[PDB]
């Protein structure tokens, strides 16, 4: 049974970059649905599996990836953010970033274009390629999770679905991404990096 | 050279079902981009084509379907709506609807579920299947246009991208669709039906 | 605990439309592999589901749809063929075919175009739409099963993967389609058709 | 005005790894069809583009990517093979392979897994990433061309469509992969590799 994780902070702790109304809706409504629906899909999948109904299992795939992916993605998203965040990472991660994308601004520039480049709903990701031993930037459609669909290990995620910024930034997604750099929780991203870096 | 079509009405003429702020943004910002970008893609496609650059042509496909589809879809969307709309269609169309989906509410119910069922960005469509001689309901991802990707002829379209309702209805898409029935321009939908019905 | 169905006839019971060699491999080799891989996949599934591992569940989807569908499709395919097969259906099924497609001949033309239409690996199908209550034609890529992927009840499927004819009919698929019509087991298609009518 | 490339060697210049029959058909028959269909498609294109017909442009996409890509892929494929082919690359290319993949052997293992990994029709590729400035491996479904679909510069492609081995190596693709390594024209791969380095 999956659970909606409590936020690591106040809904309005990311002001003015991401406002409280968006965080509240995002967490209490959007994320909450995914969790609920994921639980309903898993329950049904177990039923199909138990009676060897392959058709059922396959039909339930779109819902499981969507809601399951939604849950995975947002749970990480909350942790990637912080009220005292911003700035740049340090240590190995920063060296990895400089090494892999050139500089820190080059990193930002690449991830920004990857996120702005999403046509429709999706996410922008900074991930770790375990087989290449280096970092990597990717974009995922809708709620397709980074690791489950690409193998990469999620480090930092940027939700570019319109519900993630329209109320505040409206159509101008670029303003949304320039704004989000001020609340990245490099402390958590580093943790995720050092985590799979071994 | 493609052009952003003037609206057939006042940005606030669809109140309270679809508010003015959404219509203004939707038309002046979202639709306007698609048009602009479509023109830029077509220009570049002509260049690729002229010099036989197949790689270029293929790479430009995502942008052409997206922006081109965006343009097609919204241009129809504006016409499907009206301040004096609502109610139900009459004549053949209504008979076609009753014949094809049962009743009018059954029609609404089916199209509503098709639109609410869109995972991520997309549209809900009532179309005409020229080869089957009957009506048909379909959903399209992102900006993929009805006719260009399915062959069906668009009659009524329901934009379910979040920018189409989030500012007003927030996460509750169902409220958005129940609301939009009050502004359907059956007069234009009928025109489109009688148009391909011959 | 899915199992390999015994072929309904001898590996060469369909000469000369489809030689015993194509049947031999296609069944003994590839169908078996699909079943084996399927059981292996479902097992990894029960495991991941019990652990609440969503990422793993999503990662197992390509293998589950591909192997469970390959098993679904081919199991149906075998029963859709027969030595005494050929000609055309009688009763209700024929009536539905004339009504829904005009004539059994235009029908074959339809399915053939759908089947010959498949770019790459895939299947052409004659399925039944529970919703609309009538026959419908569809093409499915790779091993995506008709029902789990579209909800249509399969009645008659035509495997158009190159492995289903490339030996005998080489790169000319039409030759394969033209031939296969001589084998179709209309007795089975009718049973499937009747199972979903009332 | 795309044209059919003359094969670099005789249809049987690659015996016994790939018989002259597979080459014969694959080239004379299918590559030719891709070129012909491509020219036909581009023409319908210039037409639709001149008319400003976006719907038609979008409808022509499957045929354009499929036929222009089939032409792109196979043209490259031919040059990637050679009688005197086999063994391994020297100089920079080898160095990059060891560096980026560990060892030419793990490399082959990689490409093979990618190539054997393709479920359905497709291609396994050894392409170069301009961005990151190093080698990368990728798989493409059906005829989707590597560069137009991923932006990676193709260096070495391995056709894994059943028509490329089903005659000779039957349903066991590994056998085909294992064999093809004996033919690869590392002299060409190096030229392609060098063309995009500086
Ligand atoms: Mn979100
Ligand atoms: Mn819109
Ligand atoms: Mn098969
Ligand atoms: Mn080929």
Q: Taking phi first (over 0 means left), then psi (-120 to 50 degrees means alpha), and beta for anything else, what does residue C92 get?
A: alpha
State the Cα angle at C163 between C19 and C172, rounded to 5°: 80
The ligand that comes nearest to the alpha carbon of residue B70 is 2
> Is C174 in the D-facing interface, judged by CB distances under 8 Å?
no
3-state secondary structure chain D: CCCCCCCCCCCCCCCCCCCHHHHHHHHHHHHHHHHHHHHHHHHHHHHHHHHCCHHHHHHCHHHHHHHHHHHHHHHHHHHCECCCCCCCCCHHHHHHHHHHHCCHHHHHHHHHHHHHHCCCCEEEEEEEECCCCEEEEEEEECCCCHHHHHCCEEEEEEECCHHHCCCCCCCCHHHHHHHHCCCECHHHHHHHHHHCCC
- CA A107 – CA A87 distance, rounded (Å): 13
- CA D168 – CA B8 distance, rounded (Å): 64
A152-184 burial by CB neighbour count: b if 16+ within 10 A, else e? bbbbbbbbbbbbbbbbbbbbebeebbebbbebb
According to DSSP, residue A183 is labeled G
Give the domain ranges of chain D.
19-82, 83-198
> Is C122 in the D-facing interface, judged by CB distances under 8 Å?
yes
Nearest partner of D150 among D128, D183, D172, D120, judged by Cα: D128
Gap from CA of D158 to ligand 3 centroid (Å): 22
B103-127 burial by CB neighbour count: b if 16+ within 10 A, else e? eeeebbebbbebbeebbbbbbbbbb
- CA B15 – CA B18 distance, rounded (Å): 6
| Cα C20 to Cα C13, C58, C73, C174, D86, distances in angstroms | 7, 39, 20, 20, 37
The enclosing H or E element of B159 equals: strand B153-159
For the CA atoms of B60, D160, C173, C79, what is the dihedral angle to 10 degrees? -120
- CA C154 – CA C73 distance, rounded (Å): 9
Residue B66 contacts residue B143 (beta carbons within 8 Å): yes
Counting beta carbons within 10 angstroms of the beta carbon of residue D133, is it exposed (0 to 12), middle (13 to 18) or buried (19 or more)? Answer: exposed
Q: Please give the method by which this entry was determined.
A: X-ray
Q: A19-82, superfamily in CATH?
A: Fe,Mn superoxide dismutase (SOD) domain (1.10.287.990)
Residue C142 is encoded by which pair of tokens? Answer: 């790779």
- The residues, ordered by sequence, that sit 6+ positions from C87 with a Cβ below 8 Å of its Cβ are C186
Residue B139 contacts residue B119 (beta carbons within 8 Å): no
The enclosing H or E element of B139 equals: strand B134-141
Gap from CA of C190 to ligand 3 centroid (Å): 22
- CA A29 – CA B173 distance, rounded (Å): 12
Using an 8 Å CB-CB cutoff, list chain B residues near A121. Answer: 120-121, 162
The dihedral of CA C174, C180, C186, C189: what is its sign? Answer: negative
Residue B87 is encoded by which pair of tokens? Answer: 């109610």
- The residues, ordered by sequence, that sit 6+ positions from D116 with a Cβ below 8 Å of its Cβ are D124, D160, D173, D174, D177
> Is A171 in the B-facing interface, judged by CB distances under 8 Å?
yes
Residue of B nearest to D150 (CA): B59
- CA A67 – CA A144 distance, rounded (Å): 9
- The residues, ordered by sequence, that sit 6+ positions from A172 with a Cβ below 8 Å of its Cβ are none
CATH architecture for the domain at B83-198: 3-Layer(bab) Sandwich (3.55)
- The residues, ordered by sequence, that sit 6+ positions from A149 with a Cβ below 8 Å of its Cβ are A65, A69, A140, C58, C59
- The residues, ordered by sequence, that sit 6+ positions from A81 with a Cβ below 8 Å of its Cβ are A9, A14, A18, A180, A183, A184, A185
Block residue for tokens 């991923």: D150
Residue C148 contacts residue A56 (beta carbons within 8 Å): yes
> Is A121 in the B-facing interface, judged by CB distances under 8 Å?
yes
State the Cα angle at B88 between B85 and B89, rounded to 5°: 95
Pairing of strands C134-141, D122-129: unpaired
- The residues, ordered by sequence, that sit 6+ positions from A66 with a Cβ below 8 Å of its Cβ are A34, A37, A142, A143, B119, B120
Block residue for tokens 């490409």: D111
According to DSSP, residue B154 is labeled E
Residue C101 is encoded by which pair of tokens? Answer: 């497609």
- The residues, ordered by sequence, that sit 6+ positions from C50 with a Cβ below 8 Å of its Cβ are none
For C29, phi then psi, to 5°, come to: -85, -70
For the CA atoms of D71, D74, D78, D80, what is the dihedral angle to 10 degrees? 120
- CA C134 – CA C123 distance, rounded (Å): 20
Q: Taking phi first (over 0 means left), then psi (-120 to 50 degrees means alpha), and beta for anything else, what does residue A133 get?
A: left
Pairing of strands A153-159, D134-141: unpaired
Residue C138 contacts residue C111 (beta carbons within 8 Å): no
- CA D74 – CA D80 distance, rounded (Å): 9
Residue D179 is encoded by which pair of tokens? Answer: 């064999």
Residue B110 contacts residue B137 (beta carbons within 8 Å): yes
Q: Taking phi first (over 0 means left), then psi (-120 to 50 degrees means alpha), and beta for anything else, what does residue D177 get?
A: alpha
The dihedral of CA A99, A101, A104, A106: what is its sign? Answer: positive
Report the gap between the CA of B68 and the closest CA in chain D (Å).
Answer: 6
Task: Inspect the interface and report whether the beta carbons of D49 and B45 lie closer than 8 Å.
Answer: yes
> Is A154 in the C-facing interface, judged by CB distances under 8 Å?
no
Report the gap between the CA of B168 and the closest CA in chain A (Å).
Answer: 9
To 10 degrees, what angle do helices D104-117 and D91-101 make? Answer: 70
State the Cα angle at A149 between A144 and A155, rounded to 5°: 80
> Long-range pairs for C50-55 at CB < 8 Å and ≥24 separation?
C52/A1, C52/A2, C52/A42, C54/A2, C54/A38, C54/A64, C54/A68, C54/A69, C54/A71, C54/A72, C54/A145, C54/A148, C55/A72, C55/A145, C55/A147, C55/A148
The enclosing H or E element of B62 equals: helix B61-79
| Cα C52 to Cα A31, A47, C45, C58, C59, distances in angstroms | 17, 15, 10, 11, 13
Pairing of strands B134-141, B153-159: unpaired
Neighbouring-strand partners of residue B153: B128
The dihedral of CA B77, B79, B80, B81: what is its sign? Answer: positive
Task: Inspect the interface and report whether the beta carbons of B161 and A162 lie closer than 8 Å.
Answer: yes
Residue D20 is encoded by which pair of tokens? Answer: 């002259």
Nearest partner of B164 among B32, B19, B65, B34, judged by Cα: B19
- CA B145 – CA D61 distance, rounded (Å): 13
Residue B9 contacts residue B82 (beta carbons within 8 Å): yes
Task: Inspect the interface and report whether the beta carbons of B71 and D54 lie closer than 8 Å.
Answer: yes
- CA B126 – CA D100 distance, rounded (Å): 52
Q: Tell me if domain C19-82 and domain C83-198 are identical in fold.
A: no
Where is the binding site, in residues of B? 26, 74, 159, 163
According to DSSP, residue B31 is labeled I
| Cα D80 to Cα B83, D77, D87, distances in angstroms | 63, 5, 13
Residue B140 contacts residue B122 (beta carbons within 8 Å): yes
Block residue for tokens 């169908």: C31
D72-89 burial by CB neighbour count: b if 16+ within 10 A, else e? bbbbbbbbbbbeebeeeb
């Amino acid at each position: 049974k999956h659970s909606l994780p409590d936020l690591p902070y106040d809904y309005g702790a990311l002001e003015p970059h991401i406002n409280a109304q968006i965080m509240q809706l995002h967490h209490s409504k959007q994320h909450a649905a995914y969790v609920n629906n994921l639980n309903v899909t898993e329950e049904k999948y177990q039923e199909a599996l138990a009676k060897g109904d392959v058709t059922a299992q396959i039909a339930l795939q779109p819902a499981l990836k969507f809601n399951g992916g939604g849950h995975i993605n947002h749970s990480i998203f909350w942790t990637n953010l912080s009220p005292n965040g911003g700035g740049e990472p340090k240590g190995e991660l920063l060296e990895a970033i400089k090494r892999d994308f050139g500089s820190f601004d080059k990193f930002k520039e690449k991830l920004t274009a990857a996120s702005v480049g999403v046509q429709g709903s999706g996410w922008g990701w900074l991930g770790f390629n375990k087989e290449r031993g280096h970092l990597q930037i990717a974009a995922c459609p809708n709620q397709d999770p980074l690791q489950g669909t690409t193998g990469l290990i999620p480090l930092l995620g940027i939700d570019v679905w319109e519900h993630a910024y329209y109320l505040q930034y409206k159509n101008v997604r670029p303003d949304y991404l320039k704004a989000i750099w001020n609340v990245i929780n490099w402390e958590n991203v580093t943790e995720r990096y050092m985590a799979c870096k071994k």
